């Protein structure tokens, strides 16, 4: 199904390489297997209300996951956790709305978004159980995850139709977001990441649940 060389789980050099070879095929999607495309990833509609900003995103897209570099995969067979560190550049797009304020500036907006995130580092931890199925085939079954993020290099904000078309105000806001990009990544990044992470997690869990572990590991 997926092109992956078989590792011992505690050989982290190997696992980091296997994840790296699998990832692009995987994120392309596996229609017949019930695995959605994850680059470009369709994010489900969401909203958030945080630190004075009422935000929504519709027709959400996350681009970039097909080019992620896996930094390390640490498998702890004792605790039955997997730690996966990786980084990428990502673009988040869609029909956004904004009201309230961002930090010290009031905002209104109803238009299109293009967020370009450069060298975002992600720290994923998954909990899993090994589970034999009804016909006796052992599977890795994902149970929970945590994900943290750190945008190290830069984040760029493209927001159309801010301030009902007023250039002056839109220009001031856009300059403002790019100058304080880090702060803004830390204030509002979590709900965005979570929109992607829950969908990505669903599909990995679905996939691993159905593919025998012996097909993708030395167990
Ligand atoms: C070795 O055997 C194998 C396994 O073990 C058995 C495997 O598990 C697997 C797994 C299969 C593959 C390796 C695929 C693995 C997949 C992996 C590691 C991907 C995991 C991805 C995670 C679940 C989620 C990642 C999430 C992201 C990239 C999203 C990040 C986005 C972020 C942080 C957005 C940040 C946003 C901001 C900074 C600004 C936000 C602000 C605003 C929107 C508001 C702006 C202000 C207003 C005005 C608009 C394989 C292949 C295998 O072979």
TrEMBL record:
Family statement: Belongs to the TO family.
Transmembrane regions: none
Any Pfam family matching the protein: JHBP
InterPro entries (UniProt xref): Haemolymph_juvenile_hormone-bd, To_sf
GO cellular component annotations of the record: extracellular space
S-S bridge residues: 7-14
Biological process per Gene Ontology, one example term: circadian rhythm
PANTHER family: CIRCADIAN CLOCK-CONTROLLED PROTEIN DAYWAKE-RELATED (PTHR11008:SF32), PROTEIN TAKEOUT-LIKE PROTEIN (PTHR11008)
Keywords carried by this UniProt record: Biological rhythms, Signal
Name the record gives this protein: Takeout-like protein 1
């Amino acid at each position: 199904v997926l092109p992956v060389e078989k590792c011992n789980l505690e050989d982290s050099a190997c696992m980091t390489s296997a994840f790296q070879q699998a990832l692009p095929t995987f994120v392309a999607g596996l229609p017949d297997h019930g695995v959605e495309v994850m680059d470009v990833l369709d994010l489900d509609d969401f909203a958030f209300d945080l630190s004075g900003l009422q935000f929504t995103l519709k027709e959400g897209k996350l681009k970039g996951l097909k080019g992620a570099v896996i930094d390390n995969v640490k498998w702890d067979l004792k605790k039955k956790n997997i730690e996966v560190d990786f980084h990428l550049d990502a673009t988040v797009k869609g029909h956004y709305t904004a009201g309230g304020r961002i930090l010290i500036l009031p905002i209104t907006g109803d238009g299109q978004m293009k967020l370009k995130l450069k060298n975002i580092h992600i720290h994923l931890v998954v909990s899993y159980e090994m589970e034999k199925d009804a016909e006796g085939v052992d599977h890795v079954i994902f149970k929970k995850y945590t994900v943290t993020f750190d945008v190290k290099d830069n984040a760029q904000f493209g927001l159309t139709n801010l301030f009902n078309g007023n250039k002056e105000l839109s220009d001031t806001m856009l300059t403002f977001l790019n100058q304080n990009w880090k702060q803004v990544s830390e204030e509002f990044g979590k709900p965005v990441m979570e929109a992607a992470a829950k969908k990505i997690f669903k599909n990995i869990k679905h996939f691993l649940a159905k593919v025998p572990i012996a097909e993708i590991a030395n167990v």
